[PDB]
Design an enzyme around this catalytic site. Sequence first.
Site: not given
Ligand SMILES: [Zn+2]
Lengths: 185, 190, 185, 179
Positions: A96, A65, A25
Amino acid sequence: SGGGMIVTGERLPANFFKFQFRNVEYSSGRNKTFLCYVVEAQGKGGQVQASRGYLEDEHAAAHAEEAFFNTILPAFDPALRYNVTWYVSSSPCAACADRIIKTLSKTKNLRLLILVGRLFMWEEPEIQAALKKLKEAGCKLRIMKPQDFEYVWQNFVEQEEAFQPWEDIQENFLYYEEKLADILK
Amino acid sequence: GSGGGMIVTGERLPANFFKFQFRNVEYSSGRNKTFLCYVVEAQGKGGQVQASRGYLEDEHAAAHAEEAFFNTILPAFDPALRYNVTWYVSSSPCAACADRIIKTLSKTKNLRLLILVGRLFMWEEPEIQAALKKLKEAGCKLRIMKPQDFEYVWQNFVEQEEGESKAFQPWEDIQENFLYYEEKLADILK
Amino acid sequence: MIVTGERLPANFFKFQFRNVEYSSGRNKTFLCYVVEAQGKGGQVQASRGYLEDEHAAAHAEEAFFNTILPAFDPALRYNVTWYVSSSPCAACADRIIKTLSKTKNLRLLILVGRLFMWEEPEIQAALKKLKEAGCKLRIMKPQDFEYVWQNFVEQEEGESKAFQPWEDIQENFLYYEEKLADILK
Amino acid sequence: MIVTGERLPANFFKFQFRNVEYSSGRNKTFLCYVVEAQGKGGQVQASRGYLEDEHAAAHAEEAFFNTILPAFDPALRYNVTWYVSSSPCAACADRIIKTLSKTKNLRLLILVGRLFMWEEPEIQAALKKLKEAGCKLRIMKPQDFEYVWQNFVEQEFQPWEDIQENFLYYEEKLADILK
Ligand SMILES: [Zn+2]
Ligand SMILES: [Zn+2]
Ligand SMILES: [Zn+2]
Ligand SMILES: [Zn+2]
């Protein structure tokens, strides 16, 4: 019980969830992504849809996501009520989170439950603010417990022919459950 | 290990589940019982893999299972990934459904479809034989569900109430049916 | 030397003392330091100060070696000590490694309030390479915060103040100390 | 930061704090400083340190601008303050002027403990030209010695009978030289 789906070479659960199951992420770059899901839609009229699957990429441009709402679940029919459930390695990034918030806000007939292996940059105030707004958007966020890993393993990981916990599968859970609870309340 | 399950029914015998629940019937123009099982596999050359399996069912659907799928299940397609879809239906598509399938298969070139029917829907109709052939023209693969297929759908889609504690009870004419419809589809497609 | 409006230590170190290391964008930066150079000949230099920015283009790590300590004279041996809110980012780590590698007569000690993205494998690899470059990295203990407060924070009134510990000053240290160790050695 | 075995400031400022040139390229150096840089935009910079050598080839004034503040951020506005035992010599004053001439974003303040050979007409010329370059010169007040003692010398005040008398003395001398 649990059927096949994800084809992998890893044999041990601990190794799978610690490496192949990782979903990056990082606020920048185009790293790898991974995400298992479950969808169940109910409609007052005998209409029922329940699918299950997963998605991964070595170097995806968009995060798990994003990809989900762009190719897996593009649109929702008003006549149905969706109960989506995600299983990712860690909580979403600030960006996200916003994307998820704007989606849930456009689809009232969509309920989302995100189960994470652990928290991502939980100590950072930016992330904490995003998690609160996320909980406020109606998105229920929880930490994955031992039963969850076993579930994902026997239901998302394809077998051919017994789950086994690891080092600190229980302590990691309790730790992040506490931290996620402090911030969310 | 054999399979999980997302479909829930009070039917304990597969012979009944595939006779009633699995069935597709059109009572009226915009009121028909729909039911469809599927599997999606998408590979986008670059580590990006996608896999899933679900089903659809309605008792008052305005459209057939074939239409419902491409309109809500897989409305969008990632031009990068190569899609491999597999269906499990009770009967082959009708003349109209075949066209929809063909038109969709015509639009997305990165999509490959495989339909496994339990039986041939009105194979005697010359209009139906025309659809099946044109369906093969569009690059669609059609096959009659073999006895192994029913067992596959049963142990990977139908949720077993007692977890991993049940085998499979096939019906008396499970082979004659397959053999019977395999000959038909063959003559038609080639 | 640091002029601030905050009165309470806990508030200072939790907000004004923050140094953002986000892989992207141009966030804020903060960094206190100590320099001591010894030279075999009676040459001695020992300065102390700090640096901060609301929206700096470069991170604290960069600014330091670009304007505060541009060059080093071979005849001296430097003993630099940093005091930052969290450990450096992957990029900054590399920058520190390339600097220490060009300046053999430079020893660096970085004391951090907590770890940054410690769970990420990219960060862990960077910290190891960092320790291998000779850079000693440690977690700030209660005594450290008190030190920084009474020595870097300009006292509201010369001889009229005191340091006050906060609820989890010890528990936080003991947590990251154990973590940093696990990864490092 | 400064560490000495001297417990009395009267001795520390008499010996250690002193600057002496034994030979051409061998002189005892010692200088205390403070740096404050503001770059209009949230960017603030502050520090305080010192220099000392027993066999320095150059005077403290030269050593500073050659290793301590070699570079200057054209964006930030620098405010430097020195604490030396005596005013700069004719040569050092020039270096200071030439540097002050180059960087316009730099402002210097020298706080001397006494006037270095104020009787020399050559020295009086340097001080005046130093003020011309925009440099601020002042004699360390009793408060100044206490400031340097409690902010630079790693302790653990105590003024000397002539601490005030000296300030006043050199304050008058310096004044007559500038305005
Ligand atoms: Zn993300
Ligand atoms: Zn049809
Ligand atoms: Zn950084
Ligand atoms: Zn001189």
